[PDB]
Design an enzyme around this catalytic site. Structure first.
Site, PDB file in Angstrom:
ATOM      1  N   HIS A  59      -6.074  16.716 -28.736  1.00 36.20           N
ATOM      2  CA  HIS A  59      -6.940  17.766 -29.230  1.00 36.20           C
ATOM      3  C   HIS A  59      -8.216  17.161 -29.777  1.00 36.20           C
ATOM      4  CE1 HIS A  59      -8.594  21.082 -31.652  1.00 36.20           C
ATOM      5  NE2 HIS A  59      -8.023  21.841 -30.737  1.00 36.20           N
ATOM      6  N   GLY A  92     -19.243  24.205 -32.921  1.00 37.36           N
ATOM      7  CA  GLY A  92     -19.853  23.856 -34.203  1.00 37.36           C
ATOM      8  C   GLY A  92     -21.222  23.212 -34.100  1.00 37.36           C
TER       9      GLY A  92
END
Lengths: 247, 246
Positions: free
Chosen positions: A94, A170
């Protein structure tokens, strides 16, 4: 063949027994299309809890694991413990593991080989950062990441690939459905010439960028996007809309 | 009158069957009244272990992260640890520091967050072989202790654990005297940099190799206030270490 649509919910480091109980209650009551494979990844403290409460129709994933069965690794868990708690999947590589906690491709490949040897299925994550994308090296990064995973896979029937556009997470930047489809098409091409045509046709490549109830249908309609690894939306009733993205 | 403190670090070991068996033994074990016992299961089993263990034994997480909730796949928060009934966390363990690269900066932030959220902390320090042989043991463990101290306001909620990392698979081992000397130095550091009352009331536990055969001599050292036990914590032998003062 025909690739079964796949929706993973990554709860990340969120929830407590009461709040996750309510989330789980909502999921248990939700209409799960038989054409869809659903997997939820709770915080590591709640793998057992989640599996006890969730209806058998939903599978449980660990968010990470280590690369040996037992040992002197304070703070880690092994695939054997994941299975022992009734979970059948593990998320590996991840973006947060790679870029917050510094996990190497080398470590990630070793974890993949171990998890698979131990009978887990794996959601293996890849993706490029903004600097990498803007340097023109998306394909180089995602292909090398995929290569290390492939080097450590013997049964692709137990693997799902998740592409995370880390460049569009982000950063202020966002990814279009065509942009997602483009990477997924490249990735499937990669599998075809590097592993086998059978592996390329059968392997779910899921999208791990931003997805909502409003964007999910268009993204799911992309011919090489086989579903989703959902972040924040996996904690909200809207996850049900993502499960139903092909309906 | 520092309460003797024996923590069992199970590390990444065990399954429900084998840990259930171990827990049955610990539940049946007569613990001394002058002794506080804590077990740190793998993270997948904090909940399970707290449910099976008798209340005389406290439960610790092996690690945590530094915010209450967030986008940190694979992490857990103090709030989760408390929610599972555990009252402690282990932080700065040598394996987190030297296998997984956790910095002092991160560790101190974890300590502050854990304590703010109501956990008790076993905060680990220690030097590697190179540092020991360069003469900088005191420098290394004092600085590690300082980062911890910076993030501690109530010392009644922490236990310090010295880990002679230099003795792990290196070809050197620590004698009881080598243990006692660094423990004595550490207590003097607390006195000098915090208070005499903190120095006197804070447990400094020994996190190097300890067995049933060796625990009584180590526990007899005046500045060793117990153990953070590795391998022996998975066996009935752990109870011998709980009994080290008897």
């Amino acid at each position: 063949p025909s690739r079964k649509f796949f929706v993973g919910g990554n709860w990340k480091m969120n929830g407590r027994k009461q709040s996750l109980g309510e989330l789980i209650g909502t999921l248990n009551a939700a209409k799960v299309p038989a054409d869809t494979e659903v997997v939820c990844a709770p915080p590591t403290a709640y793998i057992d809890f989640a599996r006890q409460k969730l209806d058998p129709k939903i599978a449980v994933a660990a968010q990470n694991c280590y690369k040996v069965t037992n040992g002197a690794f304070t703070g880690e868990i092994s695939p054997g413990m994941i299975k022992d708690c009734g979970a059948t999947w593990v998320v590996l590589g991840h973006s947060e593991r790679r870029h917050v906690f510094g996990e190497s491709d080398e470590l990630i490949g070793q974890k993949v080989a171990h998890a698979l040897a131990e009978g887990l299925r794996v959601i293996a994550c890849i993706g490029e950062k903004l600097d990498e994308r803007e340097a023109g090296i998306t394909e180089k990064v995602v292909f090398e990441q995929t290569k290390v995973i492939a080097d450590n896979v013997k049964d692709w029937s137990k693997v799902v690939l998740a592409y995370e556009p880390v460049w569009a997470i982000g950063t202020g930047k966002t990814a279009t459905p065509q942009q997602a489809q483009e990477v997924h098409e490249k990735l499937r091409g990669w599998l075809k010439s590097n592993v086998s045509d059978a592996v390329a046709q059968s392997t779910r490549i899921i999208y791990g960028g931003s997805v909502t109830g409003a964007t999910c249908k268009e993204l799911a309609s992309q011919p090489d996007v086989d579903g989703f690894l959902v972040g924040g939306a996996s904690l909200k009733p809207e996850f049900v809309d993502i499960i139903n993205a092909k309906q």
